Amino acid sequence: DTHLADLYLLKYDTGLGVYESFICKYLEDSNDYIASHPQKLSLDEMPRPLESETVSLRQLIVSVL
Amino acid sequence: GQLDTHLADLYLLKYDTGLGVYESFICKYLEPRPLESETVSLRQLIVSVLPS
Amino acid sequence: GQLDTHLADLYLLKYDTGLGVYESFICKYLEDSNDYIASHPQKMPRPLESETVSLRQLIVSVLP
Amino acid sequence: GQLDTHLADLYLLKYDTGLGVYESFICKYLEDSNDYIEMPRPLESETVSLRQLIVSVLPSRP
Amino acid sequence: DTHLADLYLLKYDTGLGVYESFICKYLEDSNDYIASHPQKLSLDEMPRPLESETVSLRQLIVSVL
Amino acid sequence: GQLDTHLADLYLLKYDTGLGVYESFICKYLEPRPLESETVSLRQLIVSVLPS
Amino acid sequence: GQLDTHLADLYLLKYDTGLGVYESFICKYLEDSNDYIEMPRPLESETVSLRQLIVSVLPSRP
Amino acid sequence: GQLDTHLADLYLLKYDTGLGVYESFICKYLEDSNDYIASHPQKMPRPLESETVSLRQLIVSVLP
């Protein structure tokens, strides 16, 4: 069952007593290269999108039936 | 009417990762809202249908 | 404004241009509000394909 | 850049099913990378019509 | 062990009593979309590169240690 | 001398799939040769090193 | 198109190891897609030098 | 002109520009013909990294 794309469910607390929810396509790729820390020399893999402490992210996958 | 709703509530969302870079997304808001937060910024997308 | 309505009815779509090449798209189907056969006296999944258009539905799942 | 690429080649696509109804989709066109053994694209057909969906981005609010 | 790229070992009989061998990068992607028959309406998957009857192709994968 | 050898014997290779499309590759020849065939066409790549 | 993309951003890269020898590589540059919170690229450093590898394609023979 | 010489010594390479960003490359190492220490009286894998350059070797294998 071949993987076509990823989507992300993003949820974040505003600061005003409500959270906001979005279904999202991550803006990336064309190149899709391996990804590493933007602030450190290490080549250890750090997959994108990077997560924030203030934003909940869950990944979904879109595949062909 | 259904086209209008499908093309509505679309956003460019950008968040601060805490690692000195932003991540950006094209999104549908799952419904002035949506509100931003300190680390999440929003830009509304508008869709025009070119007539044929 | 909820997850299942936005993510339902996603398709790959391919059609014959009649000019020697096929066009492909990744798509969201726009369900018709009313059923065009609702009141036909001789009352078929939707979306329907055609002689020149093929569809393959997509599946959304959670990253395991 | 990434944005412009993502927002390119979006279409409202409508086709004649041959059964008295037309089906409509909002779509991303998949650019044809085949090297055939050179027309403008995507092409409509007798039964498929296309309208371009053009996306503009508003400034970020205050 | 994360997959980075594919390479192809291509070998073909010339017609003059010798075969030629090459180690190759396939020119594709940027988009990397699912691939189907170039001459038929079917959306059945037909992964690229397509093979020829006259060219032997074996795929290698490049990954990070 | 070793740079020259590494930048040598590079080709754009294109073959007829039999399905009405060509497939193309950037390649190193594993060594006038290489010869083409009826379905495989070759173009030599040349690499210039811009001085600094 | 695909060709031009593949042949872009190729470099001969040489760096000072700090141990009396320099190491040399032939390379493809990986374009930096980070959105930092805008210089010309790739940048050399004090110890890394770059030379562009420019590829031309000969016509197909008879 | 054989497979193992062309495909040996492939690397990811990343370095600190000293200007707040790192540059990354996918690379083929050019092995030095002679060993620079061959005749040093105090005779270390190659390639050597540096304070500002990191390397991660790549592996080539057959599609299973």
State the Cα torsion B26-B30-B33-B37 to the nearest 10°: -60
Contacts of D12 (CB under 8 A, 6+ apart): B3, B49, D24, D25, D26, D27, D50, D51, D52, D53
> In total, how many domains does chain B have?
1
Please name which of H58, H64, H56, H43 lies closest in space to residue H14, comparing C-alpha atoms: H56
Q: Where are the alpha helices (DSSP H) in A3-43?
A: none
Elucidated via: X-ray
Cα-to-chain-centroid distance, residue H45: 10
Set of chain C residues whose Cβ sits within 8 Å of the Cβ of D15: 15, 50, 52-53
Q: What is the DSSP string of chain D?
A: -HHHHHHSSEEEEEEE-SSS-EEEEEEEEE----EE----SSPP-SSEEEEEEEEEEPPPP-
First to last CA, chain A: 7
Q: Is H24 on the interface with A (CB under 8 A)?
A: yes
Q: Using an 8 Å Cβ cutoff, are G51 and F43 in contact?
A: no
Cβ contact, residue pair A54, B37, below 8 Å: yes
Q: Which of C7, C27, C6, C32 is nearest to C15 (CA)?
A: C27
C-alpha G42/C-alpha G37 separation (Å) is 19
- The DSSP bridge partners found for residue A9 are A23, A58
What is the number of alpha carbons within 13 Å of residue H8 lying toward its C-beta?
10
B16–G35 C-beta distance less than 8 A: no
- Indicate the residue type of H26: I
The string of DSSP codes covering B22-48 is EEEEEEEE----SPP-SSEEEEEEEEE
**Residue of D43, C23, C61, B12 lying closest to E33 (CA atoms):** C23
- Chain E hits for D30, CB-CB cut-off 8 Å, are 31, 33
Q: Which of E58, E26, D42 is nearest to F22 (CA)?
A: E26
Decide if C62 and A58 are in contact by the 8 Å CB cutoff: yes
Residue in H37, H36, H31, H32 with CA at minimum distance from that of residue H9: H31
Structure tokens at E13: 């009989």
- The letter for the amino acid at G33 is S
Q: Which residues pair with A6 in a beta bridge?
A: A61
* Interchain pair C26, D28: CB under 8 A: yes
The answer to whether the CB of E12 falls within 8 A of the CB of F37 is: yes
CB-based contact (8 Å) between F49 and chain E?
A: no
Beta bridge partners, G12, equal G26, G51
Q: Which residues contact C18 (CB under 8 A, 6 or more apart)?
A: C52, D45, D46
**DSSP code, position C37:** T
Tell me, yes or no, if E52 comes closer than 8 A to chain H by beta carbon: no
- Asked if the C-beta of A65 comes within 8 angstroms of chain C's C-beta atoms, the answer is yes
Contact residues for A30 (Cβ-Cβ < 8 A; gap 6+) = D2, D5, E30, E31
My answer on whether omega of the bond before F34 falls inside 30° of 0, hence cis, is yes
Please list, in sequence order, all residues whose beta carbon lies within 8 angstroms of the beta carbon of residue G25, skipping any fewer than 6 positions away: G12, G13, G14, H11, H13, H25, H27, H28, H29, H30, H47
CB–CB of A28 and G33 under 8 A? Answer: yes
Burial class (CB in 10 A: 0-12, 13-18, 19+), D10: middle
- Asked whether the beta carbons of residue H12 and residue E63 sit closer than 8 angstroms, the reply is no
- Match 């991660």 to its residue by tokens: H56
| F12 Cβ neighbours under 8 A, 6+ residues apart | F24, F25, F26, F27, F42, F43, F45, G3, G57
Query: What whole-number distance in Å separates Cα of residue A46 and Cα of residue A53?
Result: 16
State how beta strands F40-49 and G22-30 pair: unpaired
Token readout for C48 is: 């329907």
Name, in order, each residue with C-beta under 8 angstroms of B13's C-beta and a sequence gap of 6 or more: A10, A22, A24, B24, B25, B26, B27, B40, B41, B42
Min Cα–Cα distance to chain C from B18, Å: 24
CA distance H21 to G31: 12
User: In sequence order, what are the residues at sequence separation of 6 or more whose Cβ sits closer than 8 angstroms to the Cβ of residue H8?
Assistant: none
The enclosing domain of C25 has a CATH number of: 6.20.250.80
Which amino acid does the sequence have at E36? S
Checking phi first, is residue A16 left (phi over 0); if not, alpha (psi -120 to 50) or beta?
alpha
Pairwise CA distance, residues D56 & B25, whole Å: 15
CA dihedral sign of residues E4, D5, A6, B43: positive
Say how far residue A35 (Cα) sits from the centre of its chain: 13
The four Cα atoms H14, E9, A30, G49 give a dihedral, to 10 degrees, of 30
- For residues E35-61, one letter each, b for 16 or more C-beta atoms within 10 angstroms of the residue's C-beta and e for the rest, the string is bbbbeebebeeeebbbebebbebeebb
By the CB < 8 Å criterion, does D56 face chain E? no
Q: How many CB atoms neighbour CB C34 within 10 A?
A: 7
Which DSSP category does A45 fall into?
B
Q: Determine the structural domain holding residue G11 and report its residue range.
A: 1-62
Do F38 and G41 meet the contact criterion of CB atoms below 8 Å apart?
Answer: no
Q: Which residue has the tokens 């990378």?
A: D33
Q: Is C46 exposed, middle or buried (0-12, 13-18, 19+ CB in 10 A)?
A: middle
Judged by CB atoms closer than 8 Å, whether chains meet at H26 and G23 is answered as no
Residues of D in contact with A30 (CB under 8 A): 2, 5
Q: How many CB atoms lie within 10 A of CB F6?
A: 17
Whose tokens are 């009857």? That residue is: E53
Report CA Rg, chain C: 15
Cα–Cα distances in angstroms (integers) from residue H50 to residues C43, C49, G21, H55, in the given order? 77, 61, 11, 9
